[model samples]
Target: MNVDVKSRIMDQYADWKGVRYRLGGSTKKGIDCSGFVQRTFREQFGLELPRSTYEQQEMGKSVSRSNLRTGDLVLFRAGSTGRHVGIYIGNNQFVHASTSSGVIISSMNEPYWKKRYNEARRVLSRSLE
Candidate 1:
């Protein structure tokens, strides 16, 4: 169900803002980047996702950054941190559980993210019904 997909995504950020980031955690108390994606998709988007970043990124159809839409997965290399995943909300922002900032909406324009922009994956297509 892609009903008001953008609104639902923002609602997720409002519900989860400032929650502590955790490794392999999937609950409201603490959640990892991929864990946040897994939980958000399941609860808001009615899509189940893999737990680890490795497995999560393996699915979905690859889409260019310019082609991303709401609910798309935005990925980054993040230097030694390896892969980091965030859900594209709208405009140029995405919601993710950052190691330093917990859950926050960040921009693709940030040099840190822009430089290492890995790829975007469209897990939910417009054809989804």
Candidate 2:
């Protein structure tokens, strides 16, 4: 993984603190799940991403959840519904701006999240370390 991008992504987690929710916005004042991921990728790696979770999930290679690293996207299905998402930070935890909370860090081990967990995704790059 790109260490610089990883480091900056972690740091930018703080930048997204308190950003409100908006369906298609990717700004500090408002942004949805995919928008947040898109903005993070752009800010940290200068990479543009598809605007939806499903699309972004396909932008890169899929990885096993057990092998998830800091820069990878941790995808999960919310409830029995098909709602999905991306998030990854460090230490088995990921920071995200949630619909219920403005922004928060969650663990993959959390019962709520763990149950909904599906797969991990990463942009395939030789630069990955």
Candidate 3:
């Protein structure tokens, strides 16, 4: 993604921060990680993203952790059957809806996330528009 797109997505993150996390939630009242990504992408780029973490994992080309840029999708494993998603916002930071903290900005460098970090994907392209 370009600087403008990154800025716009970050803006949306700022607006949605503090929303309570809710399973299957998709609104500001309460939303889950996937819903947060789905809604924000729709609002920012007019793109409709999948609503589940598993489906979302297949949305774009796989990207290496070292190459991740703003707007890339980051995934994690919380448990054997659990998955989490967040949007990369550069500076090793990402924004996601957390069950414990609601929507917040977290660092990939954090011990917890770093240990659980799985992979990242890039879904946006010039052809998308």
The candidate that wins on lDDT is: 3
| Stretches of candidate 1 exceeding 4 Å from the true structure | none
Which candidate do you rate higher for TM-score, 1 or 3?
1
Residue range 52-105, candidate 3, lDDT tens digits: 888888888878867786788899887733889988888678889988789998
How much does candidate 1 score in TM-score?
A: 0.89
Q: How close is each model in CA RMSD to the real structure?
A: 2.1, 2.9, 2.5
lDDT of each: 0.83, 0.72, 0.83
Clashing pairs in 2: 1-128, 1-129
Clashes of each: 0, 2, 0
Residue 105 lDDT, candidate 1, scale 0-100: 84
Candidate 3 Cα errors over 4 Å, as ranges: 1-3, 126-129
Per-residue alpha-carbon lDDT of model 2 for 29-54, expressed as tens digits?
A: 78877888787877677787888787
* lDDT agreement of model 1 with the native: 0.83
Candidate with the greatest TM-score versus the true structure: 1
In candidate 2, position 86 carries an lDDT of 55
Lowest summed lDDT window (length 10), candidate 1: 74-83
